[PDB]
Every structure is written in structure tokens, then in C-alpha cells.
């Protein structure tokens, strides 16, 4: 949906990222899902139609976007990895192989990038 609101889906265990990262969506005229784990996260993915997400690659010591960002890249869906750590989760971020914007970063950078792969005007095929 890119006449109207992007359904995007957010990938944060920190809620002030979370709800930063909300806010910066809905400010650039879309709809947010907040999920902190992969459950929500696919939970969202099977429950609403994601047009774009956002994930957080260091959720905690093991927890980690990657069943989401799996499922994401199962279905062609984009979205960016808004991580502070990359080496802590390498390995994983070389299966997703998706754009990253590294923390710290301003929210509204890490949602209007996510937007661009979503839609805007002409798709870049």
C-alpha cells in the first residue's frame, strides 16, 4: 500500500526506539506494529499484511531478529536491520542480507529509508 498508509512492522526490545520508531513512521504517513520478538513479530506477519519492517538485529544476548527477517525475506518484504550491534549476530545478518542502519540513528532516517523500498512514486524495477 503505497496510495495510502504502509503497514510497517517494528522489531525493537527498547520501547523508546520503538515508540521513536513509531512515531517516525506515522509521521511519514504510516501504520506501525511494535513487536519485541520474533512471536509478535511473525504473529503480526501472519495476522496483518507487513509492507515494510524494521528490525532490530540485537534484541538481547541471544534473541535477535531473524525468523522475522526470514519470514520477511520469504515473502519479498522489506525492511531494514536498525542495529546497534552487527559482529554480535554476523552470521545472521549474512542470511538476511538487507540494508542496516547502525544505532545510534534517528528514527525518522531508519523509517523514511524503509518507506523508500516500500513505495513512493514509480517503482524502481
Given at each position: 500500500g503505497a496510495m495510502g498508509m504502509p503497514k510497517v512492522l517494528v522489531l525493537e526490545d527498547e520501547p523508546l526506539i520503538a515508540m521513536n520508531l513509531q512515531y517516525a513512521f506515522e509521521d511519514e504517513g504510516a501504520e506501525v506494529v511494535v513487536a519485541a520478538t520474533c512471536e509478535q513479530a511473525l504473529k503480526s506477519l501472519a495476522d496483518n499484511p507487513i509492507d515494510v519492517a524494521v528490525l532490530d538485529?540485537?534484541?538481547g544476548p541471544k534473541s535477535h531478529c531473524g525468523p522475522v527477517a526470514d519470514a520477511l525475506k520469504q515473502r519479498a518484504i522489506p525492511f531494514i536491520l536498525?542495529?546497534?550491534?552487527?559482529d554480535r549476530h554476523g552470521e545472521l545478518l549474512r542470511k538476511i542480507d538487507a540494508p542496516v542502519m547502525a544505532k545510534p540513528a534517528d528514527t525518522s532516517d531508519v523509517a523514511k529509508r524503509a518507506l523508500e523500498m516500500c513505495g513512493g512514486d514509480k517503482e524502481p524495477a
Amino acid at each position: 500500500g503505497a496510495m495510502g498508509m504502509p503497514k510497517v512492522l517494528v522489531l525493537e526490545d527498547e520501547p523508546l526506539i520503538a515508540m521513536n520508531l513509531q512515531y517516525a513512521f506515522e509521521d511519514e504517513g504510516a501504520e506501525v506494529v511494535v513487536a519485541a520478538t520474533c512471536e509478535q513479530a511473525l504473529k503480526s506477519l501472519a495476522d496483518n499484511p507487513i509492507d515494510v519492517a524494521v528490525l532490530d538485529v540485537n534484541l538481547g544476548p541471544k534473541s535477535h531478529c531473524g525468523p522475522v527477517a526470514d519470514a520477511l525475506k520469504q515473502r519479498a518484504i522489506p525492511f531494514i536491520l536498525h542495529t546497534g550491534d552487527l559482529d554480535r549476530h554476523g552470521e545472521l545478518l549474512r542470511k538476511i542480507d538487507a540494508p542496516v542502519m547502525a544505532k545510534p540513528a534517528d528514527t525518522s532516517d531508519v523509517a523514511k529509508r524503509a518507506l523508500e523500498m516500500c513505495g513512493g512514486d514509480k517503482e524502481p524495477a
